[PDB]
Design a protein around this nucleic acid. Structure first.
Lengths: 103, 178, 232, 91, 129, 100
RNA sequence: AGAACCUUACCUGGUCUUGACAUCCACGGAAGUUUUCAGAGAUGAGAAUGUGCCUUCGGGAACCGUGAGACAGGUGCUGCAUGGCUGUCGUCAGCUCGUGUUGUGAAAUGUUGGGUUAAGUCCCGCAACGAGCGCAACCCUUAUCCUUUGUUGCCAGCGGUCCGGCCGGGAACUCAAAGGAGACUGCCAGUGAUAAACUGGAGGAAGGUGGGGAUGACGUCAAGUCAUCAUGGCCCUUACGACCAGGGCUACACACGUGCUACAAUGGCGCAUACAAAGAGAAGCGACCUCGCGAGAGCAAGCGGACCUCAUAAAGUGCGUCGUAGUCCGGAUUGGAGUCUGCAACUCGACUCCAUGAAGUCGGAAUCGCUAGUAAUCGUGGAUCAGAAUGCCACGGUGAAUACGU
């Protein structure tokens, strides 16, 4: 199997927003470089919460809230520096935070 | 009550022999959800039975399931100042299961040094109609011949019946005006 | 007094959230509490305008306020000193420098908080309420929408008993997941204490004001998409 | 079992009380809030009045009680016996 | 006609991948022997159970890949993957196997642990008075 | 609700930095197994009494908005009731009612 | 939702009153940080680092100590004085708006009937006409399955090879996140007043709004919160405020509600043996490491989590072994030692582990959820999270009797 050269990771709470933001980065990479791949789905995280539904008592009725978190990876097999230059330059989003740092 | 007709599950042949009549037996042999043990108890019992008579491993199991089978049941549905009992002839799915329950109900008290032996002894016995659940049969049919007396809030039901194209006589059965 | 809150299950599809930003778990509380402080202290300044929603958004190295209004000019004030003062304090609260835009104004007469300020004014001002509930309803159905519910409480006329009253007319769905649909519960004070109106208004069962993204994954991005399938 | 883990405790509060107390050998009972504090050689022969939350209770400090805390000699909770239910209070 | 016909072997949200071909009667499980995958397990007579049922021990060569589930269960899916894969020796093959249940996926689907309840349906117990 | 537990918390965070910073690493150095016949000397561990309110064991924080104790949730900086008021109106990003 | 102090309301002990926290003034100090000593700690006194901001260059704010006011502060009282919010009935299967007509009117009618259902769903029909609410639906999710990606994913075949995608390489294959597809009593047959619909047929994973969730009428019950918070009436404001500490609900004569696990052999003992899902790890966890019976210790590559780790998932299987004797089940207690988070483990904290070893053999009165991925049962992770889960939330293992009949 392959070894990970570099990690670009996209983190969002809205599922349609991330699918669109990776597809546009992927477009920018084929237009501004030569060595791209189609976006890896990567498994989604979900945090579980429980709270009351009344101010006081009523044990039976309760409430459950969810918050979902979506992860896309792209995994461009080689970004040209000119690809990385366009990525960080055309950023403007709020539903997603794009990560270009490595670790 | 109940608006429309509602269905029943269907058991799909077990993973270690390929029988529906065995996959339903192992389902009542289950204690603490553990059918995958109840399988291990059936096949280890069945093989001990198989030394006792070699013509089939299922010999003494298959005839137990005919001989201790109740054919009749007694039902209960309170009326006012009275509880009563009202007999019904029982449907085959519960004829079969009562007998499966009773073979295993008797086995878990047999005290033998392995459960595969406990279940194998009570089957060799209930096959010949000598065992523990011949009595369980006997009682359940006695009640069904004895309780033919009773009807559901009877004194008014007996006119209500006679005009609903019922008989001039007390019907000893559930949920009818009698 | 029943039901899980009617707009709350709608928050994942065709209704926007009231705030949209992301912080990677450990800083999510620090960002949520600042997102509250900008809500609380900024609206204090625009007290004299009329406003339907407040929408706070955080890109890298920036905080963007969207505000939704009864008219476009109402927040700007004389010669932009006012809107700079708003941005001044959004920059002071937030760990970043600030942008503010006024949105496009669309159905401001049928919007959740602006229709309910119009109705709460009658009870606030201690008018007889002999005809009010009907004139509220007459004007919502005369300016638009497809159905309305109003429920008014806070001891109408000054009462020393619990005293509620209500009005529904047209179509008002409650267990619907699709389209935005506008609900507001007002809180307001008068001489005898706090009064409040619960207002559902229903504009349409299909609304395009938030809609799913233009493409699926499969047609989007690069023309030559197939892999080498090994061969480093 | 439970322990005092690994570090050194002399307690700040008994260090400063004890230093002035030792100089006379002994003086009138030392007004103590320190129920956290263990019993020590430096404290042998002092009379330590131990706040229980309601009032100070005198603990006489002596060699046989050094495996112990001040808060063990001084009580907290009340036990209703079952010869017959407790009719009366104890202070 | 294809190099190996393939079955998807669905039982209880676990998938038995099963590549069937003509050969000499052999079984391969996760690229190793039976003693390796199903070490001291009843699971070895499980996987033999669909091969006896249609009388094909000495005619299928097999390559088997399986993930998830409990071990007696992984085999129980392979018991469905072996009959899944078989469909085309004859036109009625799939009709008769579907009537016996050995193509048919376990149509029951998970129920989520529910809000306000101690399980999926388990409501609190109270005598409260 | 009450102001006194919230006041306690407000006064505590300045006493965490002031008392606690200099004692931060001090448990591993002076006490535990690294203090085998090194340090383990009484005179620098009588000085953790000043940090006694400032102690990691009272760094329980509770709600950040009000300082109000009990039933807290660190991820919002809120609690059951105060999470619910903001979820109801959509004031929290990505947070909605659950179905699957 | 994680009770030594904190938390904590309660109670007592020290100590001040603009006061924990904001603006404003008066006076010393910059705040921030480090430090000796008295004092329980609060607090106070002195010390050294720094001497910022503005400037009527006095002096002040900022923030801290002191002081006074305007004022801040109140789990302060009242839930027939309230607002905001939610619970009951009940998935009852009904309730209402607009309008006419019949009666003098309160009010009926529709909202009632026949047939049918999850349904005010649908065929028929009368003064009910027109229409909305609950339900029905869109909706998310799941299941195959259509579809694109092809990694930290996969691997019929091929290579190093323990046969692990770790890697040369390979796309038959799940598989992951996303567009979602399919199922409508629409087809065909039987039944049913044409009929909704129930059942049967057939392909498909699945025929009966496919499984699961979302999902809750007007609203009485004067149900409950002034303790999320809004808040009038309305009281203290040297306090129904505040710093600091200790003590408590975790008490003991007991009963009771709940959950757990057990009372066996379906198991447990020893040895050998197998595969999870989902999520957590940015303040944090963490392979190898050397020490340690373990817990843990102290070092640390590494990480961003489909790569590494929590985690050995357990129950279940193999073999040999056990007989009602509270044991070969069950293993609680307690002595004792090692370890941990913290000035500080005593009542009231955690963990490992050695030795001995009880109650309990399914339990009176009482007493509840369930229609099937349910119920039952087994383990896991997470939310919370100083230190502590039997609980809650979700997940996967293994997975039940029957629903005639009103």
């Amino acid at each position: 199997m392959q070894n990970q050269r570099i990690r670009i990771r996209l983190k969002a709470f809205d599922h349609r927003l991330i699918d669109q933001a990776t597809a546009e980065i992927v477009e920018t990479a084929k237009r501004t470089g030569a060595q791209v791949r189609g976006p890896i789905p990567l498994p989604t995280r979900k945090e579980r919460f429980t709270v009351l539904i009344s101010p006081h008592v009523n044990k039976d009725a309760r409430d459950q809230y969810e918050i979902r978190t979506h992860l896309r990876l792209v995994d461009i097999v080689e970004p040209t520096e000119k690809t990385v230059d366009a990525l960080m330059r055309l950023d403007l989003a709020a539903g997603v935070d794009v990560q270009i740092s490595l670790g | 009550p109940r608006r429309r007709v509602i269905g029943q599950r269907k058991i799909l042949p077990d993973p270690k022999f390929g029988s529906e009549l065995l996959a339903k037996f192992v389902n009542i042999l289950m204690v603490d959800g553990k059918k995958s043990t109840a399988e291990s108890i059936v096949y280890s019992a069945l093989e001990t039975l198989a030394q006792r008579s070699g013509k089939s491993e299922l010999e003494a199991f298959e005839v137990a399931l005919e001989n201790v089978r109740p054919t009749v049941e007694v039902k209960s549905r309170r009326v006012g100042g009275s509880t009563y009992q009202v007999p019904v002839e029982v449907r085959p799915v519960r004829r079969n299961a009562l007998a499966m329950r009773w073979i295993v109900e008797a086995a878990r008290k047999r005290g033998d040094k392995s459960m595969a032996l406990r279940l194998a002894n009570e089957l060799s016995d209930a096959a010949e109609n000598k065992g523990t659940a011949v009595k369980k049969r006997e009682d359940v049919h006695r009640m069904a011949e004895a309780n033919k007396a009773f009807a559901h809030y009877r004194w008014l039901s007996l006119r209500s019946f006679s005009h609903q194209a019922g008989a001039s006589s007390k019907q000893p059965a559930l949920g009818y005006l009698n | 007094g029943q039901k899980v809150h009617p707009n709350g299950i709608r928050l994942g599809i065709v209704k926007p959230w009231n705030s949209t930003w992301f912080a990677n778990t450990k800083e999510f509380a620090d960002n949520l509490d600042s997102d509250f402080k900008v809500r609380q202290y900024l609206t204090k300044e625009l007290a004299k305008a009329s406003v339907s929603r407040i929408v706070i958004e955080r890109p890298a190295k920036s905080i963007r306020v969207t505000i939704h209004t009864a008219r476009p000019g109402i927040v700007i004030g004389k010669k932009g000193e006012d809107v700079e003062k708003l941005r001044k304090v959004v920059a002071d609260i937030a760990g970043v420098p600030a942008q503010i835009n006024i949105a496009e104004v669309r159905k401001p007469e049928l919007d959740a908080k602006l229709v309910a300020d119009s109705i709460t004014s009658q009870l606030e001002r201690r008018v007889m309420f002999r005809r009010a509930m009907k004139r509220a309803v007459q004007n919502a159905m005369r300016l638009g929408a497809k159905g309305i519910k109003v429920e008014v409480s806070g001891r109408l006329g000054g009462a020393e008993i619990a005293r509620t009253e209500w009005y529904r007319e047209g179509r008002v769905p409650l267990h619907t997941l699709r389209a935005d649909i506008d609900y507001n519960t007002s809180e307001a004070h008068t001489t005898y204490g706090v009064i409040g109106v619960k207002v559902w208004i229903f504009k349409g069962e299909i609304l395009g004001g938030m809609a799913a993204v233009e493409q699926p994954e499969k047609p989007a991005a690069q023309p030559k998409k197939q892999q080498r399938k090994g061969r480093k | 079992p439970r322990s005092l883990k690994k570090g050194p405790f002399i307690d700040l509060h008994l260090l400063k009380k004890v230093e002035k107390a030792v100089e006379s050998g002994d003086k009138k009972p030392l007004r103590t809030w320190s129920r956290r504090s263990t019993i020590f050689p430096n404290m042998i022969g002092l009379t330590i009045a131990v706040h229980n939350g309601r009032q100070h209770v005198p603990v006489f400090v002596t060699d046989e009680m050094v495996g112990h805390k001040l808060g063990e000699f001084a009580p907290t909770r009340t036990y209703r016996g079952h010869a017959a239910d407790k009719k009366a209070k104890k202070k | 006609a294809e190099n190996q016909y393939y079955g998807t072997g669905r039982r209880k949200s676990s998938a038995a991948r099963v590549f069937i071909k003509p050969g000499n009667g052999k079984i391969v499980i996760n690229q190793r022997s039976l003693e390796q995958y199903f070490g001291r397990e009843t699971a070895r007579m499980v996987v033999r159970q669909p091969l006896e049922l249609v009388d094909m021990v000495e005619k299928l060569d097999l390559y088997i890949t399986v993930k998830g589930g409990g071990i007696s269960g992984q085999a129980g899916a392979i018991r469905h993957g072996i009959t899944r894969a078989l469909m085309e020796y004859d036109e009625s093959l799939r009709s008769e196997l579907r009537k016996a249940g050995f193509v048919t996926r376990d149509a029951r689907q998970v129920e989520r642990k529910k809000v306000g309840l101690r399980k999926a349906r388990r409501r609190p117990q109270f005598s409260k008075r | 609700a009450k102001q006194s537990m919230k006041a306690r918390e407000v006064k505590r965070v300045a006493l965490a930095d002031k008392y606690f910073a200099k004692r931060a690493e001090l448990k591993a150095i002076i006490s535990d197994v690294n203090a085998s016949d090194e340090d383990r000397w009484n005179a620098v561990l009588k000085l953790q009494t000043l940090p006694r309110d400032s102690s990691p064991s009272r760094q329980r924080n509770r709600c950040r908005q009000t300082g109000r104790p009990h039933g807290f949730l660190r991820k919002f900086g809120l609690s059951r009731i105060k999470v619910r008021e903001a979820a109801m109106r959509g004031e929290i990003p990505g947070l909605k009612k659950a179905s699957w």
